[PDB]
Tab-separated table of C-alpha atoms in Angstrom:
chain	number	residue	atom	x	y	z
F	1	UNK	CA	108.887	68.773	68.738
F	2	UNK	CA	107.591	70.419	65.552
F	3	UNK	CA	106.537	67.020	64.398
F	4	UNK	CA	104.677	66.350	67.665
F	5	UNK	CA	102.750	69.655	67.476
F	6	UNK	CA	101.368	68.650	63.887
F	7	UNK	CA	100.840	64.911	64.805
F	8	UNK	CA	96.935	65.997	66.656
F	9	UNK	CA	96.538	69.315	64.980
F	10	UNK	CA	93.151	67.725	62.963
F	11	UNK	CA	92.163	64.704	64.444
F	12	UNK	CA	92.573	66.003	68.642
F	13	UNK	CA	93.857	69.314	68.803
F	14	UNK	CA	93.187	69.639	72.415
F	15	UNK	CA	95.205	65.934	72.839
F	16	UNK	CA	98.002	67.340	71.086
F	17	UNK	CA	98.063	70.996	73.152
F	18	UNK	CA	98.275	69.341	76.138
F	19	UNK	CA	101.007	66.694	75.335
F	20	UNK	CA	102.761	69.961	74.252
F	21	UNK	CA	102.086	71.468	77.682
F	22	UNK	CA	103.062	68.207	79.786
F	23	UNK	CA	106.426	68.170	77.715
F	24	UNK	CA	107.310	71.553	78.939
F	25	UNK	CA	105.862	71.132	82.620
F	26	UNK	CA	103.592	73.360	82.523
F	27	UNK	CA	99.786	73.699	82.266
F	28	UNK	CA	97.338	74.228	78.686
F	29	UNK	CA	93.784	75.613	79.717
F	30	UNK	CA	90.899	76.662	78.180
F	31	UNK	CA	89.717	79.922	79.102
F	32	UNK	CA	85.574	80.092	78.365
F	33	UNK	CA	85.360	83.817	77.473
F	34	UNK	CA	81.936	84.218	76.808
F	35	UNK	CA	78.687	82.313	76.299
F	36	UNK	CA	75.800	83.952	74.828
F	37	UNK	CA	72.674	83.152	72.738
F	38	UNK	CA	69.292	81.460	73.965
F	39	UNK	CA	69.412	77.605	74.599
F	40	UNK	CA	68.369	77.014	70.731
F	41	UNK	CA	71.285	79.051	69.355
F	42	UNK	CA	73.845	78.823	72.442
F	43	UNK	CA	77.301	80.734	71.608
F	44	UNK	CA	80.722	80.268	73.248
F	45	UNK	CA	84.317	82.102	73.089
F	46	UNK	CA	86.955	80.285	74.138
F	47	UNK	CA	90.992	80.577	74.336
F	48	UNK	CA	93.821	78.508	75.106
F	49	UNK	CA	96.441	79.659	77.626
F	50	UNK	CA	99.321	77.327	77.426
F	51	UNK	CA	102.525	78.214	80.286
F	52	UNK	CA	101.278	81.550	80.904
F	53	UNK	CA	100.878	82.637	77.279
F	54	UNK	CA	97.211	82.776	75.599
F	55	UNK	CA	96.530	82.385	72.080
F	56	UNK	CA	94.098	83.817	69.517
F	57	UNK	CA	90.266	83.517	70.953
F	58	UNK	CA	87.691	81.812	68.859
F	59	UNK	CA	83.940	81.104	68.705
F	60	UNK	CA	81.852	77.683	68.584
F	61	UNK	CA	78.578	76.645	69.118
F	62	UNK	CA	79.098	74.288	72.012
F	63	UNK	CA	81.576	74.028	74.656
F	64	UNK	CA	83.072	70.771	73.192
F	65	UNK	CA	83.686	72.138	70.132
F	66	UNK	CA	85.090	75.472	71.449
F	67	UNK	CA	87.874	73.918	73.190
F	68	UNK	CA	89.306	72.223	70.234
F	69	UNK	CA	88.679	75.244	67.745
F	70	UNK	CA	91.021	77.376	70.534
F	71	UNK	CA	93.297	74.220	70.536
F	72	UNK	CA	93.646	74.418	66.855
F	73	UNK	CA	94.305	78.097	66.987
F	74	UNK	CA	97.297	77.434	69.448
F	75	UNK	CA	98.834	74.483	67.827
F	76	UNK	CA	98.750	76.511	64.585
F	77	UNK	CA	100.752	79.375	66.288
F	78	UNK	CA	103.110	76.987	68.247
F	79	UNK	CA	103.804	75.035	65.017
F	80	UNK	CA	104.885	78.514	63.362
F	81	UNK	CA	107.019	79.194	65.645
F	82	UNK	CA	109.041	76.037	65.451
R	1	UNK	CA	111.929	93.825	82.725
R	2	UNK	CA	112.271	95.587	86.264
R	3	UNK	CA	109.427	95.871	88.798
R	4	UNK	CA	107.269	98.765	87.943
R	5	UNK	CA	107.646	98.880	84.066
R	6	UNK	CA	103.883	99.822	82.256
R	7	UNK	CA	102.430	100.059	85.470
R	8	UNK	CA	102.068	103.507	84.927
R	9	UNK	CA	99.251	103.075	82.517
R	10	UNK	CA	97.017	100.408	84.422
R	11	UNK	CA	93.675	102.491	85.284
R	12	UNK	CA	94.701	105.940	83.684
R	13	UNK	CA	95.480	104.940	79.727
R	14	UNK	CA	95.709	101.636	78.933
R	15	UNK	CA	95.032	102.068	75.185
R	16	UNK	CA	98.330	104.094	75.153
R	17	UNK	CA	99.838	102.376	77.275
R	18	UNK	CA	99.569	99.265	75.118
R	19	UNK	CA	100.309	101.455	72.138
R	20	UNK	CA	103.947	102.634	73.723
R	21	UNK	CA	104.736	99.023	74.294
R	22	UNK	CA	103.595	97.578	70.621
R	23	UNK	CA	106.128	100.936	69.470
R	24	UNK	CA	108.926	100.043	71.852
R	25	UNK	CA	108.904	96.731	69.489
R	26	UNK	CA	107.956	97.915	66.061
R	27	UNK	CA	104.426	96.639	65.928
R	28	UNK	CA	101.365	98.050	65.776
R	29	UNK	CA	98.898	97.541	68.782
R	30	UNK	CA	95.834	96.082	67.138
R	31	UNK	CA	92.554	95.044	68.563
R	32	UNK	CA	90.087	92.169	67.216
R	33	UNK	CA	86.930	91.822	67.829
R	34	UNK	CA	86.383	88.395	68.448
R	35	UNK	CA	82.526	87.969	68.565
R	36	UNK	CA	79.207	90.216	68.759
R	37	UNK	CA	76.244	89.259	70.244
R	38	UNK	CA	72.682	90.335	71.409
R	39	UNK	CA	69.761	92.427	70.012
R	40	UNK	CA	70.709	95.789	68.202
R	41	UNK	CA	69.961	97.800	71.560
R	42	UNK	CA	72.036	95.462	73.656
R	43	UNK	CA	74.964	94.378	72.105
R	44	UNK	CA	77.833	92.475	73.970
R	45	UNK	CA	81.509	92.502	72.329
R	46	UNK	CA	84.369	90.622	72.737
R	47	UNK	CA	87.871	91.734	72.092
R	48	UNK	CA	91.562	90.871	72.370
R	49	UNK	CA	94.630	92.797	71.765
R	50	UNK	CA	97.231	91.356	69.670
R	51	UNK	CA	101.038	92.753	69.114
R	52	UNK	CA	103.020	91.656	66.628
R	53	UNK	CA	102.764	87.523	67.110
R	54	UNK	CA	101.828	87.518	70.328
R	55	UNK	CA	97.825	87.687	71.903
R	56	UNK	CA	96.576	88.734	75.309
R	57	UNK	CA	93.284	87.746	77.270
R	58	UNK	CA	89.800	88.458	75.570
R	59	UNK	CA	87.501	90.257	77.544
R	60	UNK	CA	83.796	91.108	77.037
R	61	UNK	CA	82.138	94.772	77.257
R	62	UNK	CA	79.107	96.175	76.105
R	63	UNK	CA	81.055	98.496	73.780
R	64	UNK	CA	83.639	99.174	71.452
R	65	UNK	CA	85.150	101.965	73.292
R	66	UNK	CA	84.908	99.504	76.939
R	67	UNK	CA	86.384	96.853	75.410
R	68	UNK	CA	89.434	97.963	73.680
R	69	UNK	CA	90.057	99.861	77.329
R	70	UNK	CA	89.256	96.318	78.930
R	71	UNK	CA	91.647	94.658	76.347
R	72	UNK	CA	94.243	96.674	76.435
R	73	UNK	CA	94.588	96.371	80.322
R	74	UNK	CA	93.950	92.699	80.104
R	75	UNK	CA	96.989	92.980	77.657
R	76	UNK	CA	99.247	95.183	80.709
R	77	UNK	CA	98.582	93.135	83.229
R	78	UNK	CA	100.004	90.007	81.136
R	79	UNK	CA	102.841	92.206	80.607
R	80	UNK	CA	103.450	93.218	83.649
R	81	UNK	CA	103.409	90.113	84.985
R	82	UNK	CA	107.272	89.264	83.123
R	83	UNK	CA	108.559	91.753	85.598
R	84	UNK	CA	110.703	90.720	87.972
């Protein structure tokens, strides 16, 4: 359980979030929160809601990247917790 | 928790609102700014409350004061939502 949360936590957060979610049966989405900037310095917020929880909210500079950076966030909660 | 607990604060004082809750579990009710954007004269600020190890739904606002308010209901209405 633990061990499955750390297994992703660098090289796919997002993989390992939502193998977390599927073992529950439940849901893990990525909220986008914000986007600002002009198209040569875009900006998005994003956060992960896993099972009707939602986890710390973080910035990136491209959607991509956004949704792993709020994966990583969540794992790193989830895996203190177990 | 029963139907109707913290509804009380939704739309007349969220802020405190979250504050009595983060009390009734011996945390304080903090809120992060999460990002700032825009031009000095137009700023744009996004915020989420947090209590104790748990976090609650960012929100944008063009203000400090708009969104801590926005937060903290954002936070209420996740609570609110373990009624039953």
């Amino acid at each position: 359980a633990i061990g499955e949360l750390v297994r992703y936590l660098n090289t796919n957060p997002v993989g390992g979030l939502l193998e977390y979610a599927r073992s529950h049966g439940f849901a893990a989405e990525f909220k986008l929160v914000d986007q600002s900037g002009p198209p040569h310095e875009p900006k998005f917020v994003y956060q992960a809601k896993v099972g009707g929880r939602w986890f710390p909210a973080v910035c990136a500079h491209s959607k991509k990247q956004g949704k792993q950076e709020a994966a990583d966030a969540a794992l790193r909660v989830l895996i203190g917790e177990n």
